[PDB]
């Protein structure tokens, strides 16, 4: 067994900055360490082998260093092509164990979310289910709290949220929060509010709708 730790886990940086990535080993792998980049929905592709050597075609912005048990991956002046996930892999001896990987994100300026809310559809309200969707679009950073208020009673245990990957056009995020409910419970209540709290907004915004209005 030859564990391998990789640090950090998540990292954000702007275009043009320099970023260092660390891959620690539980043994002196000598220098048979390989770094990969994986973009969303594609297969990994090598960036560095033998700790320092760059294969054909990989830009010289990338540079690896280190020996023994500490090793580093380095990127001078991040151009926008470089924001996926980075895995280290040792080739000292089988098994060829992989590192945990580090996800790398672009860091732009703060951008407040636009908030939409959607009541259930009568088509959906023919089958006994009721889902209320709150939409957030083109905001940054990605940390955003969405709280559901049913008759102004704070809601818990019935919300499910999902975030999109960093957008390629403008490096913003999007979020849907879906309040799942039973039909009988949905018809019982009236005011369905979605309250969004985000860095980019000064005051927590609320979007609501009356079931009867």
């Amino acid at each position: 067994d030859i564990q391998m730790t990789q640090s950090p886990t998540s990292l954000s940086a702007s275009v043009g900055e320099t970023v260092t990535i660390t891959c620690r080993t539980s043994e002196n792998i000598h220098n048979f360490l390989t770094w990969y980049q994986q973009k969303q929905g594609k297969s990994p592709q090598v960036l560095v082998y033998n700790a320092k050597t760059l294969p054909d075609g990989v830009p010289s912005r990338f540079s690896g260093s280190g020996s023994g048990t500490q090793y580093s991956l380095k990127i001078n002046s991040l151009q926008p092509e470089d924001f996926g996930t980075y895995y280290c892999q040792h080739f000292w001896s089988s098994p060829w164990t992989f590192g945990g990987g580090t996800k790398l994100e672009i860091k732009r300026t703060v951008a407040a979310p636009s908030v939409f809310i959607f009541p259930p559809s009568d088509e959906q309200l023919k089958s006994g289910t009721a889902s209320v969707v709150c939409l957030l679009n083109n905001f940054y950073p990605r940390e955003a709290k969405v709280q559901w208020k049913v008759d102004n009673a704070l809601q818990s245990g019935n919300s499910q949220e999902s975030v999109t990957e960093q957008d390629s056009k403008d490096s913003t995020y999007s979020l849907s929060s879906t309040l799942t409910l039973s039909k009988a419970d949905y018809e019982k209540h009236k005011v369905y509010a979605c309250e969004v709290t985000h860095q980019g907004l000064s005051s927590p915004v609320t979007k609501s709708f009356n079931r009867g209005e």
């Binding site: 098994p95 636009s114 969707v133 879906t178």
Partner: protein, 219 residues
């Protein structure tokens, strides 16, 4: 033309069996070292197995969690490597990659996986398949979309007006629900001066269940 093409994935019962095939062309296959790697959203990349050609040494290596259950095979006249998986568990769910290493000899200086395959998805689960129920999300700038609810397994593919909408379209990743079924939401952001007059059609397609349903979204 150096390419690896995987196949054989899909949904399978726990304790079931599945044979992943990996065809290759563009390079002489009968001396390359082939490796299987899998990827799940939790553990990331994980090496699974390796098979070498013409090596009196072990020649076949396995990760510790898959010895006994898995077996890697090779046939040189077919230029392909195989992964027979047995006693499959939910662990074993993930995207499986075929890849060639740069090692020709026992210890060839210069080690790395230089060519990868697109990957083949493997889903290990006891839940039966199910087509999605597509519900509408009705309304300076407006927003509207669809609720692709209760389908299994992944993936479902969503397009708008048949590949006709590009900017502003956001299809969120599928989330598993308490019932054990997936839903998904695709939303499009349109200028407010185009609602109703232009028809927005929602192209849902779930090939695991042979479903092809389109629903109009109307304000």
């Amino acid at each position: 033309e150096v390419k690896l093409e995987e196949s054989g994935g899909g949904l399978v019962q726990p304790g079931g069996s599945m044979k992943l095939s990996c065809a290759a062309s563009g390079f002489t296959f009968s001396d390359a070292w082939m490796n299987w790697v899998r990827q799940s959203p939790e553990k990331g990349l994980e090496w699974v197995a390796e098979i070498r050609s013409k090596v009196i040494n072990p020649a076949i290596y396995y990760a510790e969690s898959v010895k006994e259950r898995f077996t890697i095979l090779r046939d040189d006249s077919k230029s392909s490597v195989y992964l027979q998986m047995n006693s499959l568990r939910a662990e074993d769910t993930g995207i499986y990659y075929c890849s060639r290493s740069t090692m020709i000899t026992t210890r060839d200086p210069s080690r790395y996986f230089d060519v990868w395959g697109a990957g083949t998805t493997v889903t290990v689960s006891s839940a039966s398949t199910k087509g999605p129920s597509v519900f509408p999300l009705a309304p300076g700038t407006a927003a509207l979309g669809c609720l692709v609810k209760d389908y299994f397994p992944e993936p479902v593919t969503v397009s708008w007006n048949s590949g006709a909408l590009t900017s502003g379209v956001h299809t969120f990743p599928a989330v598993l629900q308490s019932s054990g079924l997936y839903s998904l939401s695709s939303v499009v952001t349109v200028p407010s001066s185009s609602l109703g007059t232009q028809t927005y059609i929602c192209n849902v397609n779930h090939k695991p269940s042979n479903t092809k349903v389109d629903k109009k979204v109307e304000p």
